[PDB]
Amino acid sequence: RMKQLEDKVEELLKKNYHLENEVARLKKLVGER
Amino acid sequence: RMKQLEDKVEELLKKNYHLENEVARLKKLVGE
């Protein structure tokens, strides 16, 4: 279970980083409009 | 440490949902 929980933290951190990248991209578009 | 890791998953999930909501709203704003 400890390894599974560690893996899930790592998974969510990567999902979150993807979303942060999307938010940056969209904020750039917002600025341009 | 099991419990502390569970708490971290929970914090990262709430953050995930916050960012998902933010992406959706920014997308609707810009017509994507």
From Swiss-Prot, chain B:
Fill in the PTM field for this protein. Phosphorylated by the cyclin-CDK PCL5-PHO85.
Extract the ranges annotated as region (Leucine-zipper).
5-26
Spell out the subcellular localization from the entry: Nucleus
Q: What induces it?
A: Translation is induced by amino acid or purine starvation, or during growth in low or poor carbon sources. Translational repression during nutrient-rich conditions is dependent on four uORFs (upstream open reading frames) present in the 5'-UTR of the mRNA; these promote ribosome dissociation. Translational induction occurs in conditions reducing translation machinery efficiency, leading to ribosomes scanning over the uORFs, and increased translation of the mRNA. The rapid translational induction is followed by transcriptional induction at later time-points, independently of the uORF sequences.
Quote the disruption phenotype from the UniProt entry.
Abolishes recruitment of the mediator complex to the upstream activating sequence (UAS) of amino-acid starvation responsive genes. Decreases RNA level of genes involved in amino acid biosynthesis and cofactor biosynthesis during amino acid starvation or methyl methanesulfonate stress. Growth dependent on amino acid supplementation. Sensitive to amino acid starvation. Sensitive to purine starvation. Decreases cellular glycogen levels during glucose starvation.
- Which top-rank group of organisms is this from? Eukaryota
The record's family statement is: Belongs to the bZIP family. GCN4 subfamily.
How are the domains described in the entry? Residues 89 to 100 and 106 to 125 define the N-terminal activation domain (NTAD) and the central acidic activation domain (CAAD) respectively, which can function independently to promote high-level transcription of the target genes.
- State its role: Master transcriptional regulator that mediates the response to amino acid starvation. Binds variations of the DNA sequence 5'-ATGA[CG]TCAT-3' in canonical nucleosome-depleted 5'-positioned promoters, and also within coding sequences and 3' non-coding regions. During nutrient starvation (low or poor amino acid, carbon or purine sources), it activates genes required for amino acid biosynthesis and transport, autophagy, cofactor biosynthesis and transport, mitochondrial transport, and additional downstream transcription factors.
Q: How does it assemble?
A: Homodimer. Each subunit binds overlapping and non-identical half-sites that flank the central CG base-pair in the pseudo-palindromic motif 5'-ATGA[CG]TCAT-3'. Interacts with the mediator tail; the interaction with GAL11/MED15 is direct. Interacts with the SAGA histone acetyltransferase complex. Interacts with the SWI/SNF chromatin remodeling complex.
- Name the chain's protein: General control transcription factor GCN4
Intact protein stretch covered? 249 to 280 of 281
